[PDB]
Copies of this chain bind each other. A is one copy, B any other.
Amino acid sequence: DLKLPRQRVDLVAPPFVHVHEQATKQGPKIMEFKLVVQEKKMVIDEKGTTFQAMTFNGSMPGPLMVVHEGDYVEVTLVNPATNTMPHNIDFHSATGALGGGALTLINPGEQVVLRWKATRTGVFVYHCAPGGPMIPWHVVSGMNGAVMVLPRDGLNDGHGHSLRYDRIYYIGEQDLYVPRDEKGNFKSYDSPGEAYSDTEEVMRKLTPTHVVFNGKAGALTGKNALNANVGENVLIVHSQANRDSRPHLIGGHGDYVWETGKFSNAPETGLETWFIRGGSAGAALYKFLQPGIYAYVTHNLIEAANLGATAHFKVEGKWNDDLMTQVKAPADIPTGSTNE
């Protein structure tokens, strides 16, 4: 028997993150989480396209789980009988049994309890992986999230200095493969099973129809922009379970970036754009220096602007004219100019 204190965590919906400590003096615990599979139709773009999604806890991405190195993570995975297919879970943070996949296959009406030891620090993908062609289909239907395993001393810069965030956001990026009819319009289906054959045809050509953050084009823009303040160190965890991405904070930088996402490696400093290899999570820390709107994109700008992959930060504070200033506002080009 494993004789450690137990602590139940209540997950919250992305892009927010459940409460946790960075540095901790607590010893190892059995951290208890519950993920409930939900198959449901969801809206994925600004024109109202719908999609037969499959999710952990009703969101794309699934929620961010946060533990510390040496914790045991005890996950109750639930597959309600309102669902139509089997599901499971593969933690890239875990060791053995296909990440847990081989121990968590559950039919609708069932649940299972998996424990894995958090021996490896970093941010990691988790995803459903039932077997064979169902693996990609469940993942690109939305069944993926991430887990962060923090060192007990918190983050550091790989050169002996502590790093601490004031705020954390989890950006899950999702590649979607939505069939079109002969007229070029997106097709709708009454169940995931009915969508499968047509969807697999799109998947096979490896070109997503949509690339979205937090499950939908515009999810994190407008009213749902991410808030910050000048001076705050913000950790931005980015995951992509199936396909590469290249995150960029427009008007900012990555001050410290773990592109491969693993805290045993020193972060890179001062990046413009980073790279999340498909099947992983990475993380970037940035201290905001200027107020205003920032866009956070994948820097395939076609994906960002035209397929859905733009988030906004709204940053409060005072403008720093030393860092940047408009010396002269737009004006007519001088009559006496020559420019050739």
Contacts and interface: CB of A to CB of B under 8 A. Distances in A.
A260 B246 CA distance: 11
Given A119-B323, A326-B114, A301 B242 contact: yes
Interface in A276-321: 277-281, 289-290, 292-295, 299-307, 319-320
A136 B298 CA distance: 12
A95 B272 contact: no
Contacts of A295: 98
A261 interface: yes
Interface residues of A, number: 112
B273 A279 contact: yes
Nearest to A103: B326
Interface stretch (A10-18, A160-168, A190-198, A201-209): A201-209
Interface in A92-112: 92-107, 109-112
Contact of A135 (B106, B203, B301, B326): B301
A228 B124 CA distance: 25
The residue among A103, A273, A280, A320 with the most chain B CB atoms within 10 A of its own CB is A273
Nearest to A132: B305
Nearest to A34: B339
B253 A107 contact: no
Contacts of A101: 250-251
Given A302-B206, A303-B206, A330 B111 contact: yes
Given A132-B305, A135-B301, 18 more contacts: A92-B273, A94-B251, A95-B289, A95-B323, A98-B251, A98-B293, A103-B326, A111-B331, A111-B333, A114-B327, A125-B272, A129-B301, A205-B207, A206-B300, A243-B300, A273-B277, A273-B279, A278-B299
28 contacts: A96-B323, A97-B324, A98-B251, A98-B292, A98-B294, A99-B251, A103-B324, A103-B326, A109-B333, A110-B330, A110-B331, A112-B326, A113-B327, A115-B325, A122-B272, A136-B302, A205-B207, A207-B207, A244-B244, A244-B275, A265-B269, A265-B270, A273-B277, A273-B278, A274-B277, A277-B299, A278-B300, A279-B299
Interface of A: 2, 36, 74, 78-81, 90, 92-107, 109-117, 119-122, 124-125, 129, 132-133, 135-136, 139-140, 200, 203-207, 241-244, 246, 248, 250-253, 259-262, 264-265, 268-275, 277-281, 289-290, 292-295, 299-307, 319-320, 322-333, 337, 339
